[PDB]
Design a protein around this ligand. Structure first.
Ligand SMILES: [Cl-]
Ligand SMILES: [Cl-]
Ligand SMILES: [Mg+2]
Ligand SMILES: [Mg+2]
Lengths: 200, 197
């Protein structure tokens, strides 16, 4: 039960982004998934895991707004929320960020197909990489070109893992790269794993 | 001015939310200047140790009262209450709305009924902020008559619809009848407030 300013801000932000207030919503992903996203960013911040937050696959922007908000709550000035998608138009998503006072230089957009946008994206490192989308191709493109920038201790979150195509992209990528970090359930559809450094 | 602490962010968001700036239904339509003024008044009372509860008379869907409870919550104030007085936009609806923000609790109390009936007996002993919304001479005078005397020195009286002649007249008559000359301060085109000396 929230009591600090921070907790109250973040609790309200979850309620807001998911339109719990006015039963349109900026994300439909639900509390468990928003909570997980919070846990992952907070753990990265807390354990000093370096890097930005990258979200691929975007509805109206609620989960990314929430991520910028978390960083704002802890007054983090040196990390960026990358928002990657085809484009639910880009203008709409910017407007939405703007509505929460969270459209600023620490939010950057990557319009285009992921095979095009990912190899060159100016981020050097990621602390959290979150994929939303049930397509094998999108999932594999993001893994192939962005996961290698995910810091040890960082999180990879797969929103639509229960969908076989998505799952398969995830297993194939992991098996190809020898990755056996524990897959942890978030809810009926999503999972994540925390990246371990290579052995020594 | 530009929020950065947890408290400022919470309150800023709560203003944006209660006014439905996010998704433009809204819980209050009174606007930022007026929400800001309400915040300044509650914060000043808290900071300057002005004792008492917050009383709001005249209620739409409850946004301004929600905001007030939120302000007290942000500074973890456990010893003051937000009184929500109105006819009844039904009482159930307003409660549900408080509830949506996680702010429906024992520090929010409701006073359904006409102000001539509800005010004389309302269990609050003192007020730090008294806010009137409504353009009726009668409602305005009823609240001033039976509640203003419980407003602590240093407390604030806010008049949402002061530009409306009927409201203005109730306010000037009440002040002249009681010798009150505390400066009337403009909030925007329609509302004003004064701080009790
Ligand atoms: Cl899209
Ligand atoms: Cl009403
Ligand atoms: Mg999904
Ligand atoms: Mg009014």
């Amino acid at each position: 039960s929230p009591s600090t300013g921070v907790e109250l801000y973040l609790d309200l932000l979850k309620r807001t982004v998911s339109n719990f207030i006015y039963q349109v919503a900026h994300t439909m992903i639900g509390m468990k998934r928003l909570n997980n996203l919070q846990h992952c960013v907070e753990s990265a911040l807390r354990d000093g895991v370096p890097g930005d937050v990258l979200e691929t696959g975007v509805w109206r922007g609620g989960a990314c707004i929430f991520a910028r908000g978390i960083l704002k709550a802890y007054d983090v000035r040196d990390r960026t929320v990358w928002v990657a998608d085809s484009f639910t138009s880009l203008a709409t998503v910017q407007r939405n960020f703007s509505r929460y006072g969270l459209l600023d230089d620490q939010v950057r957009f990557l319009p285009g197909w992921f095979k095009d946008t990912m190899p060159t994206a100016p981020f050097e490192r990621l602390a959290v990489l979150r994929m939303d989308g049930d397509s094998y191709g999108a999932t594999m493109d993001v893994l192939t070109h962005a996961y290698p920038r995910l810091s040890p201790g960082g999180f990879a979150i797969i929103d639509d893992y229960c969908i076989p195509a998505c799952r398969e992209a995830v297993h194939e990528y992991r098996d190809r790269h020898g990755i056996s970090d524990e897959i942890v359930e978030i809810d009926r559809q999503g999972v994540y794993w925390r990246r371990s450094a290579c052995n020594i």
